[PDB]
């Protein structure tokens, strides 16, 4: 799936850079372009992608400091300059557009829905939001920003693929290492999903999986491959289970309307019975009547299952997240 990335805010520009960097290093070429939009000048200066600074007449290049409503207003006023960065960038070859944002911030939170709603109303391709959910320890302000933002993008975007920061943690890590590690894991997951269509899993399988709308999740897990395909039947079953149950970008995302199961690895090592049974298992676990599947042939000593879940519902993490956010607002209104 050939795509155009637009980061909004600091986290968004960082994740958008990591994804483009993954696509470039591997040579997949799925990312046709990447642009970062922000209101903090310093954030933009460090990024290796095209950058657009907006809002200087309001906040003088120093960000909106977690003010969601200021983040939205600036994107409203300055969207033409944003859209115009995309003129020569959203080419004809684009099969989708990802608006990448941290939902808890001010700029991404405010600007992402605005830009998503603007793009969705003109381009023929799907507009997706790759949205970062704040960790549960983050301040009430960030929970509230994300709550409102998530609600808005879930209506305006064609789908919202969610990344839970709390899902990607390593003991002992520094603050910046943590963020980079999250971005890098997301980049590999999303990049492979985008690359599968470029060869074999048609890009249309991704589109039809996300077509239902609302929240999506992306699962990943891998295992060493034996050269003999028959030895890898268990490996395919278990990576697929892990991808759906533990390795998902949003925790507890099993209950989904649609799914796409991609088994990646060397063709000779991928067993027929493993793949068939793994897909059937996903269908039983999700309850979905729209489980699609395909294989991604690539050089590796391993096998992996990459499972996209579209129309995710009844996720404990999402429900917990919305619950605390509403409690912050209730407490704030007094």
């Amino acid at each position: 799936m050939k795509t155009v990335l637009i980061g909004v805010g600091q986290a968004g520009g960082k994740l958008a850079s990591a994804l483009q960097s993954f696509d470039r290093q591997t040579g997949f070429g799925a990312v046709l372009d990447a642009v970062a939009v922000n209101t903090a000048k310093a954030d933009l200066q460090s990024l290796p992608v095209e950058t657009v600074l907006i809002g200087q007449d309001r906040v003088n290049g120093h960000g909106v400091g977690g003010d969601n409503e200021l983040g939205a207003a600036v994107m409203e006023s300055d969207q033409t300059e944003v859209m115009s960065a995309l003129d020569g960038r959203v080419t004809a070859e684009a099969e989708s557009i990802f608006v990448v944002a941290g939902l808890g911030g001010g700029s991404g939170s405010g600007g992402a829905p605005v830009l998503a709603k603007a793009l969705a109303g003109v381009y023929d391709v799907p507009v997706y939001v790759l949205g970062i959910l704040p960790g549960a320890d983050e301040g009430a302000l960030y929970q509230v920003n994300a709550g409102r933002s998530l609600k808005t993008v879930a209506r305006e975007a064609d789908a919202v693929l969610l990344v839970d920061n709390d899902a990607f943690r390593s003991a002992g890590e520094s603050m910046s290492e943590g963020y980079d590690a999250i971005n890098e894991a997301i980049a590999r997951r999303v990049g492979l999903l985008l690359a599968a269509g470029e060869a074999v899993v048609d890009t249309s399988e991704v589109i039809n999986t996300l077509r239902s709308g609302g929240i999506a999740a992306l699962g990943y897990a891998s295992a060493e491959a034996s050269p003999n395909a028959e030895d890898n039947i268990n490996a395919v079953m278990s990576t697929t289970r892990r991808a759906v149950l533990t390795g998902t970008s949003l925790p507890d995302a099993s209950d989904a309307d649609a799914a796409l199961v991609v088994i990646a690895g060397e063709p000779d090592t991928i067993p027929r019975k493993g793949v068939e049974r793994a897909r059937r298992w996903v269908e039983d676990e999700t309850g979905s009547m729209q489980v699609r599947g395909g294989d991604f042939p690539l050089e590796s000593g391993r096998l992996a299952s990459l499972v996209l879940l579209g129309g995710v519902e009844r996720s404990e993490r999402v429900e917990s997240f919305m619950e605390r956010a509403r409690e912050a607002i209730d407490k704030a209104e007094t």
């Binding site: 492979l192 690359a195 060869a199 042939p297 690539l298 050089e299 590796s300 000593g301 391993r302 096998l303």
Partner: peptide, 13 residues
């Protein structure tokens, strides 16, 4: 098949 230049496994850890 997508062939890998460089020593890092695409599906590595």
């Amino acid at each position: 098949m997508w062939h890998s230049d460089d020593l890092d496994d695409l599906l590595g850890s």
